[PDB]
Design a binder for this molecule. Structure first.
Ligand SMILES: Cc1cc2nc3c(=O)[nH]c(=O)nc-3n(C[C@H](O)[C@H](O)[C@H](O)COP(=O)(O)O)c2cc1C
Ligand SMILES: O=Cc1ccc(O)cc1
Ligand SMILES: O=Cc1ccc(O)cc1
Ligand SMILES: O=Cc1ccc(O)cc1
Length: 379
């Protein structure tokens, strides 16, 4: 009955349904930012979603800004992720790795040699940041030299190479929620006077250069990108967001990527917020000719309506999938939804992570079986 449960052809990846597990930072990486058998269980549990997008995964230590998030820049991290992608896949799931660089949303205590976080311009975000040594005020970041942007692009390329060896079906470029690429896009944070600043074309340049680089590793139909066209999250602002994101989406459309993943304005990064904006998925559907994922604040009823009225092709769910590993089955049965517990979103252990229940206990047993086999396979 539900279009949400209709299988979907993602250019040769046949997704079981039109529901996506949104990327969700959970801060449960092991030593040296290496994924664990518990992470493998978590994703295996959620393999019933048509497509999984991982938690944001830093391409370098410079690109990290929160405790215990996983990386993709070392061989040990690759081998940890192999456990995850093997357990997914054995459950006949499909999974893309979200590539991250936090830009100015970090702290020198996370950085190599106690260096400052990097950014397009030396402007600190408002407020405070969690560090190993307690909550601290944000620092003014270091503005990147023109010649340094290519090195960060190369970090994305190397991250894509590692994602491929880890077995990911594809990769998603995180260009949303106030991190490095988003900081370049928007003129509230990008004050540069070189070829990466000024015009809308110049402000998008770094994004196109990242896409150019990772599309030398993965074919374009296995590279997605995530944008947040209208958010105040992490002190973001731009003088003409309709012009900026119309240009960007129109350019992205010509590149024939895997998909474009858009966050609805009613979400401020990780929380709900009331807001009047026209820059929702309906604004962008006519501007983008490919696969369009809509995310942010959806329920069963509103996600289904987005698909029925052809405003998007796939609907991503974040907090509901945290709490409901078998969310597609629950939707199909019109079953209750387990409530999501924000207190256990970030950090911690199995509690509020892998202990949310399934409708069918055999589903939980199968996820455990495949996670355990993957751990033996890739120990
Ligand atoms: C705990 C938590 C972690 C998140 N981590 C990420 C992330 O790593 N990368 C990202 O692009 N978005 C992240 N988000 C935003 C979500 O992907 C999603 O857009 C948001 O939760 C709104 O969708 P929802 O109403 O379905 O939860 C996170 C959100 C939450 C609540
Ligand atoms: O560099 C150390 C290392 C450890 C375990 C691995 O699987 C790979 C590399
Ligand atoms: O750590 C939390 C987080 C929130 C939003 C993101 O996009 C990425 C990470
Ligand atoms: O890794 C532990 C952790 C806890 C709370 C956070 O907000 C982030 C990370």
């Amino acid at each position: 009955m539900l279009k949400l449960l209709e299988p979907f052809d993602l250019n040769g990846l046949e997704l079981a349904n039109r529901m996506v597990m949104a990327p969700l930072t959970r801060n449960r990486a092991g030593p040296r930012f290496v994924p664990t058998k518990m992470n493998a269980l978590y994703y295996a549990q959620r393999s019933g979603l048509g497509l999984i997008i991982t938690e944001a995964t830093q391409i370098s230590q410079q690109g990290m800004g929160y405790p215990d998030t996983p990386g993709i820049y070392t061989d040990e991290q690759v081998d940890g992720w192999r456990m995850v992608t093997e357990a997914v896949h054995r459950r006949e799931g499909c999974i893309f790795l979200q590539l991250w660089h936090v830009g100015r949303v970090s702290h020198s205590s996370f950085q190599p040699n106690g260096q400052l976080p990097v950014a397009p311009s030396a402007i600190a975000p408002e407020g405070e940041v969690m560090t190993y040594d307690g909550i601290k005020p944000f620092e003014t970041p270091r503005a990147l030299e023109t010649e340094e942007v290519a090195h960060i692009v190369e970090d994305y390329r190397k991250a894509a190479i590692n994602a491929k060896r880890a077995g990911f079906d594809g990769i998603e470029i995180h260009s949303a929620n106030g991190y490095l690429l988003h900081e370049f896009l928007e003129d509230g944070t990008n004050k540069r006077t070189d070829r990466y600043g000024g015009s809308i074309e110049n402000r998008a340049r770094i994004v196109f250069e990242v896409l150019d680089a990772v599309c030398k590793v993965y074919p374009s139909r296995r590279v997605g990108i995530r944008l947040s066209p209208d958010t105040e999250f992490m002190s973001m602002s731009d003088s003409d967001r309709p012009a900026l994101y119309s240009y960007l989406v129109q350019e992205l459309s010509r590149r024939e990527l895997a998909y474009l993943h858009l966050i609805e304005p009613r979400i401020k990064g990780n929380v709900d917020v009331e807001k009047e904006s026209s820059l929702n998925v309906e604004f962008f559907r006519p501007l983008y000719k490919g696969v369009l994922i809509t995310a942010g604040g959806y329920q069963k009823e509103t996600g289904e309506e987005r698909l029925q009225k052809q405003h998007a092709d796939l609907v991503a769910y974040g907090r509901w999938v945290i709490a409901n590993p078998d969310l597609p089955s629950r939707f199909e049965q019109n079953a209750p939804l387990n409530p999501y517990d924000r207190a256990t979103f970030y950090g911690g252990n199995e509690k509020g992570y892998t202990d949310y229940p399934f409708l069918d206990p055999r589903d939980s047993q199968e996820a455990l079986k495949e996670a355990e086999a993957a751990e033996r396979k890739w120990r």
